Amino acid sequence: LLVPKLTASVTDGAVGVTVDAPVSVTAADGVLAAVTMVNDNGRPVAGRLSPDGLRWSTTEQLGYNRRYTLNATALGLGGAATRQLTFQTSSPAHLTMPYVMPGDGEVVGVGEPVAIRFDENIADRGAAEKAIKITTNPPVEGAFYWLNNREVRWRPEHFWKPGTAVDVAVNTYGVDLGEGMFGEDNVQTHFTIGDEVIATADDNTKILTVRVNGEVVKSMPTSMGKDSTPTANGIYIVGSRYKHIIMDSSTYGVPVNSPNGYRTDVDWATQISYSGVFVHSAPWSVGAQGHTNTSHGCLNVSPSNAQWFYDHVKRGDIVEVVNTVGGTLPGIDGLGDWNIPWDQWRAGNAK
Ligand SMILES: *C(=O)[C@@H](C1=N[C@H](C(=O)O)[C@H](SCC(=O)OCCC)[C@@H]1C)[C@@H](C)O
Numbered sequence: 001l002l003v004p005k006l007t008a009s010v011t012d013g014a015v016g017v018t019v020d021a022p023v024s025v026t027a028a029d030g031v032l033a034a035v036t037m038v039n040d041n042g043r044p045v046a047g048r049l050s051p052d053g054l055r056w057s058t059t060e061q062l063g064y065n066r067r068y069t070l071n072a073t074a075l076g077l078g079g080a081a082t083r084q085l086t087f088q089t090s091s092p093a094h095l096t097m098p099y100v101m102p103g104d105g106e107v108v109g110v111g112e113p114v115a116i117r118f119d120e121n122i123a124d125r126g127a128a129e130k131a132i133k134i135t136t137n138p139p140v141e142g143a144f145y146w147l148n149n150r151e152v153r154w155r156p157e158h159f160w161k162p163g164t165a166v167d168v169a170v171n172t173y174g175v176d177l178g179e180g181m182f183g184e185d186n187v188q189t190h191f192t193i194g195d196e197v198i199a200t201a202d203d204n205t206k207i208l209t210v211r212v213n214g215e216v217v218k219s220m221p222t223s224m225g226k227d228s229t230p231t232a233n234g235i236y237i238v239g240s241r242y243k244h245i246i247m248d249s250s251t252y253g254v255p256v257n258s259p260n261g262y263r264t265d266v267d268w269a270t271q272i273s274y275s276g277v278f279v280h281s282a283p284w285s286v287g288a289q290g291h292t293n294t295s296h297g298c299l300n301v302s303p304s305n306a307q308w309f310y311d312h313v314k315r316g317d318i319v320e321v322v323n324t325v326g327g328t329l330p331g332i333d334g335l336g337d338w339n340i341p342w343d344q345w346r347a348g349n350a351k
Contacts, residue, residue, distance in 0.1 A: 004031075018174045023047075038068065047059040090176070095181070096184055110161070125350040132154070143346045162193055172184075201320070206223065210313070221301065230325045231277065231293075238313055240315070285300050
């Protein structure tokens, strides 16, 4: 008769054991009679033994910088076997917490990229991407692209199809993100794509036309950026919306007391770039709207049209500006992702 065999997922004396996966023990030619795992302090980890008694596994999160001791005994018809193993888990120099947008259970527009922002610079971008699992339904090709050292975005080639489920599991706990930086925790979010809403601002007509699934539902006279501070052409993703907000030029780099500086309270503001472009209420320019550009770059519209926009446009909806004397909105603006050519985005920039 054969003596029971014990196999563990870790080796006695191991160091740098990653904590992204459970620790397990398996018996062969017998079953597991006793398994305990204990940290340096003496506290048990505990986990669960399978019903057939063949596999034990931890069931809670294992900690960084721990010395664990595993003790296991297997019993079989042919006798007994016991083993003791001590190992040390990863010791991070730093932890980083990821933050994901959009919010869990949200419904968003067809332009919304998956956004994962880390609170620390990521030295190994590849390791981060590999730890992020995106499920789409219906399935669609997409890719990762970094806007800066901390935030990565994922999107398809073209605007999402309405009705698409998107699931984002950021599995960075126990993952080495480079230079001793490990993930502080896992995060998980899920969202759904809603109606196709695209609003086009044509500088030739100075009308902002809102299309819902192809049909015009609103036509808003607008005043865009005056020639000296023009509105950039391109595709903008709708971000946050505000019943009212103080626009502070210093937020976007420009001292208030300077020529292009400003600090003004405005109503019904919908953000469409990080660089500070908003659709908002502009009572002072209702006579210019539909005729001449007078703003610092914002899409000035009437109070009721700004409120309409606030009520009817959602995060991830699309604003496209065309035929202005500006250039093109930067691809790495923060809400300019769609202006990056697919061949470039798809190639990514992890290295
Ligand atoms: C957008 O253009 C910016 C924001 N909107 C405006 C604007 O009218 O362009 C303000 S300036 C308002 C001002 O100087 O006096 C208040 C009424 C005339 C501000 C510049 C920013 C967020 O891009």
